[PDB]
Recover the amino acids of this structure.
């Protein structure tokens, strides 16, 4: 009685694993993972057994795998005894004799074959599942990994990795002291909200995304879903300037890798083009909302209407003249603002240009900072800056990381946009300055969920995350303002359906 | 064979537990903790046994404790059989008969007596220790808890709690003698190098981890600082900076501290709290004259305000200690045209602090309570660009004031404890002026680094197990935030480890 694990690499949506007798992809790291997971053993005087079908045995050239024993399921292959590293059985059931006798076999791996997978899961021989989720779906398959039965639950989901612009994930499925916890519970019974742990309660299972993954929430999309869960658990019900009240907490953070993937949420289709258009609108220094409306981007329409402007005391302002906001403090900080039609070339401090110059002239400098919080101009703005401050860091291996402090975070609408936007901005700065993308950390003050999003976000929490996509630039620009939407290629983005959520004005 | 736990409340330094036959303090929550930990059982048809000495039995009025069975060790008390809730034994060894027979006893607690504690530890009967550390040392004791033997290791240390301005901690000591996920993660980290982000944030090795036996119970929020030190020592890249002293640096970290039940002043090192207050009130008043700090015997800004340093950074025209428009000039006169430190700036610039107070007490649920010091127009005029760059403030529904701080650059040896204590004091001042209670303090850090001439010192600091945080109280309620004086601050129950000298990088 020992352990049996399926090892498979399947596509993310349709679970395709093969085409015309070979693999539909070439990922070296996935083969290295197969090797290390099938060689992983405890007793040096024992070997592991790798069960595979006959066509799979043909796929690997009919040659043995070093240090392991291959078990081929075939009804026609001659039961040869010459090779002690390869043995043939007439059916999968008889081949499980590695359990009964043969104490020199430590662990068993079901290594390939749609038929082998299917009748190993149907016969309930499988204890564990090592699944490599590959983000390739618009290709041809003829062999599929069967659907994982409900008796299995996921216990691990790795970060997204990238090979040849292909995103992939690693997941584990499993078939399914107290004294410290008791003392903490007693202290939390004695002290009420006086104990800070009671103010940061762990989210209940009903609001926790994929709860069976307890210790292996490595995929960095969990940094967003778990913040959603924390707000749902501990969020105080509070009113704000809009008619829609929120559930709010104060002081949170999220980390995202940008070396091996692009942090665009997969549990919901995100409008990446509107994000890019808003970001390039910021970079060019523009505050004219009509330039966004003309490009079919309407995210600033609510905060730039005649009624809203007259209500907040800017009735003199033109229709979509948002005032000195993001991109006017970026390029013309402390500049005397008049209208959106005037020429501001030369006035104010160009934070972006000085930032680029310092990033490529003094990388280890600790002052790479871009701010939008200008107390002298807050009254002239249609909306004070939400993503308030950002800092940039050049690693010793020439990667560019970004920190963002955001004073107020609409988790339903604003947060995915902010994640993708500052990811794109860090990538642009890295290309312009000759670096690679690093990490993205977002520090949040008032993180809140609007009450008219509760149905939506909870729905989003029911969807198990998929591996992040990749984002590449088609050309190397000479100035950061020259980026165009056609220059951006989004590779391997297979999200869940769109979740409509109304904005609070 | 069942579990045996000592339960004791002792002072933080000398381990005093009694005086003149009674307790040297009155902490209700600690008695409630004793009750809940001695009543905690699994079988409803069983009871717990509480072993105590005879003088201890006199201290509690010689009356039984509800739902439990008291075991009194005495050589003269009559072995009465009338009370089934109290039983007497002639020695501690015979009283351990609860193990051999009496299956109605689930757990055993050694509940008091210096002699009982001492010969229960000497006889090696004790499995666990529940210790309440009380921060009271300048009083008289006649009864002490014996030294914890080396066979015990701490596994839990709670946050600091406050009762009647007295700080205390809860700790657990234990006597000592799935893997699939870990193996898969290790294999992925072998395949991918620094390509796997986990390998860029490696868990600190035991040799640089403060009190390593506390694995799952690092609740004391001083661990938020020591663990950041450890993370920098583990993953910090060796980097040069504008000073001659290189650092080990990482990017993107955070620390949380409670301010409702304690004051986050580090205990693993004696911190100059007076200099912190003086610098903070110097900021609040709008002052940029370093001589005003030097006159009060505070020399933290001398290095960045010398004639040589000013001439070196291009401010040779500037007077000796004229630091320029820095912290407290952007607070009170933001975007104001700076001349010298002697001129009158009353009215010029934006008074961020005043508007912050007005908005905090007029619109508490507003999401724009922000104080910034990063002014790109004035960076060149500053003797040093702002480190604690931006701060935001939040009013909870229960009328508490919490603070978030983004800090672009963090000297963990010198600057970080000062920043923690300083923004704690500032949040408390704002809370008193606006009529709230102190809440939480979160610090978000960009370049968190350790200067290489601090490595020995901080390592020394990492060898010291943290003590409970002290309390900080104000003696009077001021009418304006600028009226705070050093005499107005009372620091109660601060018993730190000795000072660790560390030189500043200019
Ligand atoms: N992405 C991944 O992880 C993997 C992908 N693949 C891909 O999948 C494809 C091959 O898999 P697949 O098409 O399913 O072929 P198989 O690997 O399952 O091999 C099938 C053969 O196994 C024997 N066999 C299967 N079931 C039985 C049974 N119940 N009794 C007796 N013999 C049996 C038969 O051999 P016989 O005809 O001699 O009787 C059968 O022809 C290839 O493209 C391969 O590259 C393969 C492995 C892993
Ligand atoms: N902070 C805390 O957690 C606690 C503090 N305390 C404090 O400590 C003080 C009292 O404790 P303490 O002074 O140590 O007195 P004790 O509680 O240890 O009681 C001592 C008595 O126990 C009996 N005894 C002890 N050892 C033996 C033995 N080997 N054989 C027979 N009898 C024995 C003797 O009783 P006899 O003379 O009858 O033979 C002895 O006089 C009080 O101030 C109390 O408030 C008490 C409990 C807990
Ligand atoms: C059966 N098969 C197809 C194949 C391809 N990718 C997979 N990926 C996964 N996650 N799981 C599988 N079962 C799997 N199977 C295989 C099996 C082994 C090798 C192989 O060459 N293995 C070498 C790998 C050498 C190296 O890259 O280090 C080894 O030593 O195990 C190739 C294809
Ligand atoms: C022996 N003793 C002194 C005393 C005081 N503080 C301590 N604190 C600790 N952590 N551990 C001790 N052994 C301890 N002992 C005691 C024991 C019980 C009670 C007592 O009144 N217990 C009630 C608690 C009453 C309450 O609700 O406050 C109970 O139900 O157990 C008081 C003093
Ligand atoms: N289903 C989806 O998740 C989804 C699909 C499509 C879009 C799309 O715009 O294409 C979308 N995003 C928005 O509507 C949207 C709107 C505005 C801002 C930024 C902002 C400016 N002022 C704001 N004031 C408040 N209260 N809150 C905000 O967020 C913003 C960011 C995003 C969401
Ligand atoms: N560690 C101890 O035990 C200890 C004991 C006593 C004192 C004391 O001054 O009494 C002390 N603090 C300082 O020396 C000190 C000095 C300066 C600043 C702020 C600052 C301004 N410019 C800085 N440039 C750099 N690189 N780094 C800084 O921190 C600062 C804060 C603190 C530490
Ligand atoms: O980039 C943005 N990110 C964001 O989260 N908001 C949300 C935050 C808040 O829910 C709302 C307005 O913030 P406040 O009402 O505090 O002024 O806009 C707006 C943006 F433009
Ligand atoms: O309040 C302060 N906090 C702080 O951490 N420093 C340290 C951070 C850094 O080690 C040094 C100079 O920062 P920088 O070289 O990035 O300008 O001052 C200075 C302060 F005044």
């Amino acid at each position: 009685e020992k352990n049996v694990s399926i090892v498979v690499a399947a596509s993310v949506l349709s679970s395709g694993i093969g085409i015309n007798g070979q693999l539909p992809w070439s990922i070296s790291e996935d083969l290295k993972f197969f090797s290390k997971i099938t060689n992983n053993k405890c007793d040096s005087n024992k070997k592991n057994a790798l069960i595979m079908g006959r066509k799979t045995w043909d796929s690997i050239g009919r040659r043995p795998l070093k240090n392991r024993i291959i078990v081929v399921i075939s009804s026609s292959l001659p039961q040869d005894e010459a090779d002690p590293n390869v043995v043939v059985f007439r059916n999968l059931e008889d081949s499980i004799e590695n359990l009964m006798n043969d104490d020199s076999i430590e662990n068993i791996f079901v290594c390939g074959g749609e038929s082998i997978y299917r009748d190993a899961l149907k016969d309930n021989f499988v204890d564990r599942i090592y699944l490599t989720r590959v983000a390739l779906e618009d290709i041809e398959f003829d062999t599929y990994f069967p659907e994982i039965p409900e008796t299995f639950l996921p216990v691990y989901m790795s970060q997204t990795f990238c090979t040849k612009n292909i995103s992939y994930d690693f997941m584990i499925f499993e078939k399914q002291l107290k004294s410290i916890d008791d003392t903490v519970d007693l202290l939390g019974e004695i002290f009420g909200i006086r104990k800070m742990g009671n103010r940061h309660k762990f989210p209940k299972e009903e609001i926790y995304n994929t709860p069976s993954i307890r210790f292996g929430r490595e995929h960095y999309e969990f940094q967003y879903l778990d913040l959603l869960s924390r707000v749902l658990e501990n969020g105080a019900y509070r009113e704000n300037r809009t008619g829609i009240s929120t559930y709010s907490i104060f002081g949170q953070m999220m980390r995202f890798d940008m070396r091996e993937s692009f942090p665009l949420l997969t549990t919901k289709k995100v409008a990446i083009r509107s994000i890019f258009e808003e970001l390039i609108w910021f970079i060019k220094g523009d505050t004219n909302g009509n330039h966004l409306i003309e490009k079919k981007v309407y995210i600033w329409s609510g905060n730039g209407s005649k009624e809203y402007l007259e209500r907040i005391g800017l009735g003199h302002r033109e229709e979509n003249d948002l005032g000195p906001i993001y991109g006017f403090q970026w390029r013309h900080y402390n500049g005397e603002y008049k209208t959106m039609h005037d020429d501001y070339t030369g006035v104010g401090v160009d934070q972006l240009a000085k930032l680029i110059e310092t990033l490529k002239n003094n990388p280890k400098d600790r002052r790479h900072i871009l701010t939008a919080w200008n107390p002298s101009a807050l009254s002239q703005m249609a909306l004070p800056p939400c993503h308030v401050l950002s800092q940039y860091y050049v690693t010793n291996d020439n990667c560019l990381s970004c920190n963002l402090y955001q004073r107020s975070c609409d988790l339903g609408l604003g947060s995915p946009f902010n994640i993708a936007s500052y990811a794109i901005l860090t990538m642009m700065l890295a290309q312009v300055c000759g670096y690679e993308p690093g990490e993205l950390a977002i520090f949040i003050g008032d993180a809140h969920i609007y009450e008219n999003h509760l149905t939506q976000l909870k729905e989003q929490l029911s969807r198990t995350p998929r591996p992040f996509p990749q984002l590449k630039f088609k050309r190397k620009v000479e100035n950061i303002e020259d980026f165009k939407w056609e220059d951006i290629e989004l590779i391997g983005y297979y999200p869940y359906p769109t979740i409509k959520m109304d904005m609070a004005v």
About this structure: Chain B touches chain A through 83 residues (CB under 8 Å). Residues A 366-367; B 241-242, 384-385, 387-388, 409-411, 415, 419 surround UFP (ligand 8) (CB under 6 Å). Residues 478 and 484 of chain B are 7 Å apart (CA to CA). The first strand of chain B starts at residue 3 and ends at 11.
